[PDB]
Every structure is written in C-alpha cells, then in structure tokens.
Design a protein around this motif. Structure first.
Motif, PDB file in Angstrom:
ATOM      1  N   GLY F   1       0.799  -1.041  -0.151  1.00  0.00           N
ATOM      2  CA  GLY F   1       0.135  -0.150  -0.092  1.00  0.00           C
ATOM      3  C   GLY F   1       0.896   1.220  -0.078  1.00  0.00           C
ATOM      4  O   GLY F   1       2.230   1.292   0.193  1.00  0.00           O
ATOM      5  N   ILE F   2       0.344   2.438  -0.491  1.00  0.00           N
ATOM      6  CA  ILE F   2       1.114   3.660  -0.441  1.00  0.00           C
ATOM      7  C   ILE F   2       1.657   4.157   1.107  1.00  0.00           C
ATOM      8  O   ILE F   2       2.571   4.398   1.194  1.00  0.00           O
ATOM      9  CB  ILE F   2       0.420   4.680  -1.178  1.00  0.00           C
ATOM     10  N   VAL F   3       0.610   3.914   1.920  1.00  0.00           N
ATOM     11  CA  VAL F   3       1.197   4.307   3.166  1.00  0.00           C
ATOM     12  C   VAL F   3       2.319   3.367   3.739  1.00  0.00           C
ATOM     13  O   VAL F   3       3.554   3.923   4.059  1.00  0.00           O
ATOM     14  CB  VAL F   3      -0.168   3.879   4.506  1.00  0.00           C
ATOM     15  N   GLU F   4       2.155   2.173   4.000  1.00  0.00           N
ATOM     16  CA  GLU F   4       3.283   1.299   4.292  1.00  0.00           C
ATOM     17  C   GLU F   4       4.538   1.517   3.575  1.00  0.00           C
ATOM     18  O   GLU F   4       5.704   1.643   4.029  1.00  0.00           O
ATOM     19  CB  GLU F   4       2.916  -0.300   4.146  1.00  0.00           C
ATOM     20  N   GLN F   5       4.334   1.787   2.298  1.00  0.00           N
ATOM     21  CA  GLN F   5       5.412   2.292   1.273  1.00  0.00           C
ATOM     22  C   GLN F   5       6.190   3.711   1.223  1.00  0.00           C
ATOM     23  O   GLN F   5       7.237   3.828   1.058  1.00  0.00           O
ATOM     24  CB  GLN F   5       4.953   1.885  -0.096  1.00  0.00           C
ATOM     25  N   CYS F   6       5.107   4.638   1.460  1.00  0.00           N
ATOM     26  CA  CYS F   6       5.367   6.119   1.425  1.00  0.00           C
ATOM     27  C   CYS F   6       5.536   6.674   2.879  1.00  0.00           C
ATOM     28  O   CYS F   6       5.768   7.936   2.631  1.00  0.00           O
ATOM     29  CB  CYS F   6       4.572   6.664   0.582  1.00  0.00           C
ATOM     30  N   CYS F   7       5.320   6.079   3.704  1.00  0.00           N
ATOM     31  CA  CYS F   7       5.255   6.880   5.343  1.00  0.00           C
ATOM     32  C   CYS F   7       6.396   6.203   6.185  1.00  0.00           C
ATOM     33  O   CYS F   7       6.660   6.629   7.053  1.00  0.00           O
ATOM     34  CB  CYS F   7       3.954   6.496   6.007  1.00  0.00           C
ATOM     35  N   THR F   8       7.102   5.165   5.516  1.00  0.00           N
ATOM     36  CA  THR F   8       8.459   4.443   6.355  1.00  0.00           C
ATOM     37  C   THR F   8       9.593   4.828   5.291  1.00  0.00           C
ATOM     38  O   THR F   8      10.693   5.147   5.733  1.00  0.00           O
ATOM     39  CB  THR F   8       8.373   3.162   6.259  1.00  0.00           C
ATOM     40  N   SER F   9       9.310   5.677   3.864  1.00  0.00           N
ATOM     41  CA  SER F   9      10.367   5.909   3.195  1.00  0.00           C
ATOM     42  C   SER F   9       9.747   7.079   2.077  1.00  0.00           C
ATOM     43  O   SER F   9       8.798   6.984   1.740  1.00  0.00           O
ATOM     44  CB  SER F   9      10.930   4.546   2.321  1.00  0.00           C
ATOM     45  N   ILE F  10      10.270   8.030   2.239  1.00  0.00           N
ATOM     46  CA  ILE F  10       9.898   9.195   1.114  1.00  0.00           C
ATOM     47  C   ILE F  10       9.687   8.698  -0.392  1.00  0.00           C
ATOM     48  O   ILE F  10      10.773   8.345  -0.939  1.00  0.00           O
ATOM     49  CB  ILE F  10      11.057  10.567   1.060  1.00  0.00           C
ATOM     50  N   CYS F  11       8.447   8.671  -0.964  1.00  0.00           N
ATOM     51  CA  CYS F  11       8.378   8.226  -2.048  1.00  0.00           C
ATOM     52  C   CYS F  11       8.728   9.385  -3.082  1.00  0.00           C
ATOM     53  O   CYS F  11       8.646  10.464  -2.618  1.00  0.00           O
ATOM     54  CB  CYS F  11       6.895   7.777  -2.360  1.00  0.00           C
ATOM     55  N   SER F  12       9.217   9.251  -4.122  1.00  0.00           N
ATOM     56  CA  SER F  12       9.547  10.012  -5.264  1.00  0.00           C
ATOM     57  C   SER F  12       8.312  10.341  -5.843  1.00  0.00           C
ATOM     58  O   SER F  12       7.390   9.711  -5.773  1.00  0.00           O
ATOM     59  CB  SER F  12      10.696   9.341  -6.229  1.00  0.00           C
ATOM     60  N   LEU F  13       8.482  11.335  -6.939  1.00  0.00           N
ATOM     61  CA  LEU F  13       7.239  11.739  -7.723  1.00  0.00           C
ATOM     62  C   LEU F  13       7.023  10.552  -8.460  1.00  0.00           C
ATOM     63  O   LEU F  13       5.714  10.359  -8.958  1.00  0.00           O
ATOM     64  CB  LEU F  13       7.800  12.854  -8.761  1.00  0.00           C
ATOM     65  N   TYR F  14       7.983   9.609  -8.972  1.00  0.00           N
ATOM     66  CA  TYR F  14       7.969   8.571 -10.013  1.00  0.00           C
ATOM     67  C   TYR F  14       7.007   7.358  -9.053  1.00  0.00           C
ATOM     68  O   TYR F  14       6.342   6.773  -9.697  1.00  0.00           O
ATOM     69  CB  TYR F  14       8.901   8.173 -10.560  1.00  0.00           C
ATOM     70  N   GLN F  15       7.343   7.429  -7.646  1.00  0.00           N
ATOM     71  CA  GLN F  15       6.701   6.330  -7.115  1.00  0.00           C
ATOM     72  C   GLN F  15       5.120   6.522  -6.702  1.00  0.00           C
ATOM     73  O   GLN F  15       4.309   5.649  -6.632  1.00  0.00           O
ATOM     74  CB  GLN F  15       7.456   5.826  -5.657  1.00  0.00           C
ATOM     75  N   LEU F  16       4.885   7.953  -6.595  1.00  0.00           N
ATOM     76  CA  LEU F  16       3.727   8.287  -6.174  1.00  0.00           C
ATOM     77  C   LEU F  16       2.913   8.117  -7.392  1.00  0.00           C
ATOM     78  O   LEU F  16       1.629   7.752  -7.241  1.00  0.00           O
ATOM     79  CB  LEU F  16       3.863  10.159  -6.002  1.00  0.00           C
ATOM     80  N   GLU F  17       3.524   8.438  -8.570  1.00  0.00           N
ATOM     81  CA  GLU F  17       2.642   8.379  -9.833  1.00  0.00           C
ATOM     82  C   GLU F  17       2.258   6.899 -10.036  1.00  0.00           C
ATOM     83  O   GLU F  17       1.156   6.741 -10.930  1.00  0.00           O
ATOM     84  CB  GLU F  17       3.649   8.721 -11.183  1.00  0.00           C
ATOM     85  N   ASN F  18       2.641   5.853  -9.429  1.00  0.00           N
ATOM     86  CA  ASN F  18       2.197   4.641  -9.705  1.00  0.00           C
ATOM     87  C   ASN F  18       0.820   4.486  -8.811  1.00  0.00           C
ATOM     88  O   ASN F  18      -0.179   3.739  -9.212  1.00  0.00           O
ATOM     89  CB  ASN F  18       2.975   3.890  -8.809  1.00  0.00           C
ATOM     90  N   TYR F  19       0.548   5.338  -8.209  1.00  0.00           N
ATOM     91  CA  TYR F  19      -1.019   5.589  -7.570  1.00  0.00           C
ATOM     92  C   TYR F  19      -1.990   6.480  -8.338  1.00  0.00           C
ATOM     93  O   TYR F  19      -3.044   6.738  -7.781  1.00  0.00           O
ATOM     94  CB  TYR F  19      -0.922   6.051  -5.990  1.00  0.00           C
ATOM     95  N   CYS F  20      -1.749   6.862  -9.343  1.00  0.00           N
ATOM     96  CA  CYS F  20      -2.550   7.911 -10.358  1.00  0.00           C
ATOM     97  C   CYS F  20      -3.441   6.543 -11.049  1.00  0.00           C
ATOM     98  O   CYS F  20      -3.241   5.505 -11.454  1.00  0.00           O
ATOM     99  CB  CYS F  20      -1.680   8.389 -11.351  1.00  0.00           C
ATOM    100  N   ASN F  21      -4.474   7.294 -11.575  1.00  0.00           N
ATOM    101  CA  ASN F  21      -5.541   6.399 -12.372  1.00  0.00           C
ATOM    102  C   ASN F  21      -4.840   6.336 -13.607  1.00  0.00           C
ATOM    103  O   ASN F  21      -4.320   5.158 -14.316  1.00  0.00           O
ATOM    104  CB  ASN F  21      -6.852   7.288 -12.512  1.00  0.00           C
TER     105      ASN F  21
END
Ligand code: CL
Ligand code: ZN
Lengths: 21, 30, 21, 30, 30, 21
Positions: F1-21
């Motif tokens: 999930g984004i939380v487990e993935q982006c709240c323990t480690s700073i997600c980059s703009l590209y990792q964030l984009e994986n959660y886009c439609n």
C-alpha cells in the motif's frame, strides 16, 4: 484537551465536533 | 513539541471543515 | 539549517523570519 | 526522512506567510 | 495511527498534484 | 500500500505516480 486527545489517538469526525462552537 | 505542533495544524484544518459555519475554538493549553 | 533547527524545536515567528529574503 | 519530510512541508507553509512579499528560500540540505 | 494519519494527509496532497487530471486513488487499507 | 510504502520511506514523484489512475 484536543491535542492530548487527538494527537495520541485518531479522533473521529464526531470527536472533533465536540470542539465546535 | 514539534510532532505535536505538526498534529495541531491538522487538527485546526479538520475543525474548520467539520464545524463549518459553527466555527470552532482551538486551545493548545496542556 | 532550518530543518535541523525547526524540526527538533518549534521555531518562533521570529526564528522563521531569519529565512526570509 | 519522512517525519522530516512532513515537517519541512509545514516549514515552507510558515515561511510563505511570515515573509510575505519578501519571499523566502528553502534549502533542505544537511 | 496518528503519525500515519498525518502522513496520509500529505500523500493525498502529493497525489493530487502529481496525477493532475489523471485523478488518483487512495486506499488506507493495511 | 502507499502508506506502508510512502510513510516509512520518502516516495519520489515517480513512486507516487504509480498511484495515479
Ligand atoms: Cl505532519
Ligand atoms: Zn502535516
């Protein structure tokens, strides 16, 4: 207080409303 | 006090929405 | 830096102003 | 780095207001 | 759950910008 | 999930984009 109450535990929308006028 | 200062910012944010026209009061006191 | 300075301790409005142009 | 990334977001926010027209500079460097 | 609730708020914020018109989905699930 | 993935480690703009439609 809201802090001691809502920063140690996620206050729900209803717990938050207790701080409304 | 920082983690707490960060949290409060969000609290106020959430009070603004929840309460709407009712307005709200924020007292950081102990 | 502001981070090391303002994320370990709450910077006041006056400490923040030191980072203004 | 997260707690620090969260904090910085608020810093910038607070610099924007405090400094106003003066503008401001944000350097996350060590 | 708070530190995590704080973090998520920023996530959504960052998804809104990154994705733009694409829109996005946020699922807090485990 | 984004939380487990982006709240323990700073997600980059590209990792964030994986959660886009
Ligand atoms: Cl935060
Ligand atoms: Zn925040």
């Amino acid at each position: 207080g809201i802090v001691e109450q809502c920063c140690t535990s996620i206050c729900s929308l209803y717990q938050l409303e207790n701080y409304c006028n | 006090f920082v983690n707490q200062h960060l949290c409060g910012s969000h609290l106020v944010e959430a009070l603004y929405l929840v309460c709407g026209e009712r307005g709200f009061f924020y007292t950081p006191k102990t």
